Amino acid sequence: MPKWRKTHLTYRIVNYTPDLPRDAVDSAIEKALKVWEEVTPLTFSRLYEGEADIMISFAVKEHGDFYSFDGPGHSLAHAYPPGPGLYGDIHFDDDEKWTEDASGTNLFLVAAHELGHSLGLFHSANTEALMYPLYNSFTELAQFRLSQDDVNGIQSLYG
Amino acid sequence: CSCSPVHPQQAFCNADVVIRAKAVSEKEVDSGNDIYGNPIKRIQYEIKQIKMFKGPEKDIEFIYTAPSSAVCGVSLDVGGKKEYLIAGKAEGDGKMHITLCDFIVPWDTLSTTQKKSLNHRYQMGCECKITRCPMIPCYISSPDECLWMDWVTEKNINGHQAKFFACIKRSDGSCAWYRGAA
Ligand SMILES: [Ca+2]
Ligand SMILES: [Ca+2]
Ligand SMILES: [Ca+2]
Ligand SMILES: [Zn+2]
Ligand SMILES: [Zn+2]
């Protein structure tokens, strides 16, 4: 699938990084979703048990998927395009120090990018696009904005 | 996939295997699996190992990576007579895997000092921390640490420090950038 065949999607935060209280992880992911809810007819709802479409988790090195994390730096996270099971899921590398601000690796910025993949987006060559794989929109959080390149991509899939 | 950039020394020190290679052929394979029915595909590149700077005695013959960039898959120019320096992870005899976030550059793009650093100088500095400075001003926390300033001073990941410097421990315990020798 380059896209989900439904409007109402589910997600679940399966496990939690030591670097942050659970409420702070919850909030960063909620905001990252919002980013995509504001420009599409998609709505997401949270599941606290069982299998959601988008299973979000933290892992280090090998974590069962043939794509091992690689320690501090390098790859910070990865995700799977739409589909059943592992597809649509998001994994964060817990050898990063996940933060709410820009002091460490910012969870919200990364989660937003990866959700793009979960929804069907590929990488952009535009260095001001969220979907650019290298910090996407380097710092400005309290005035972060999807780029129009990102909006075009996502609206090309879901209107 | 989300990457943070890497100075070559960091790559070299973090990677299990560092080789000069050419990719000759490409094809999909299924190595898995997945806990429901549904399988995980990986691109397998067939390579020729031209030279090894770090890694196992048995030559690498295959490099794996993901099919999509969403999971950090990378394209090598196959057939196309293209030589690369590849830093990545060993995955059993004659196999390694790479990602989008790995240090992987065409051989011919390397500076002379980068190439020479693969013999020894990068290895000497693995005990040192290399920290990318997000914006001026930035400060070392610990004495055994160099500040990577290429992005901040050049807006270029393969900047001056990348091209010419290694972060080496300095008798005493401080680390510092050095443009080198050999
Ligand atoms: Ca899923
Ligand atoms: Ca990592
Ligand atoms: Ca962590
Ligand atoms: Zn994973
Ligand atoms: Zn990505």
Author numbering:
A (entry chain D): 105 to 263
B (entry chain A): 1 to 182
What does the paper say about this structure?
The matrix metalloproteinases (MMPs) are a large family of secreted and membrane associated zinc-dependent endopeptidases with key roles in extracellular matrix remodeling. MMPs are produced as zymogens requiring activation by other proteases, and once activated, proteolytic activity is further regulated by a family of endogenous inhibitors, the tissue inhibitors of metalloproteinases (TIMPs).
The structure of human MMP-10cd bound to human TIMP-2 was determined at 2.1 Å resolution in space group P1 with two complexes per asymmetric unit. The two inhibitor/enzyme complexes in our structure (molecules A/D and B/F) showed small but noticeable structural deviations throughout, and alignment of the two complexes yielded an r.m.s.d. for all equivalent Cα atoms of 1.150 Å. Specifically, regions of poorer electron density for the second TIMP-2 molecule (chain B) include AB loop residues 30–41, the connector-D loop residues 78–83, GH loop residues 132–143, and the loop connecting helices H4a–H4b (residues 151–157). Close interactions between the MMP-10cd and the C-terminal domain of TIMP-2 are quite minimal in this structure. In total, formation of the two complexes results in burial of a similar area of solvent accessible surface: 1247 and 1232 Å2 for MMP-10cd and TIMP-2, compared with 1173 and 1242 Å2 for MMP-10cd and TIMP-1. Our data suggest that these peripheral interactions have the potential to significantly enhance MMP/TIMP binding, although they do not appear to be well optimized to do so in the MMP-10/TIMP-2 complex.
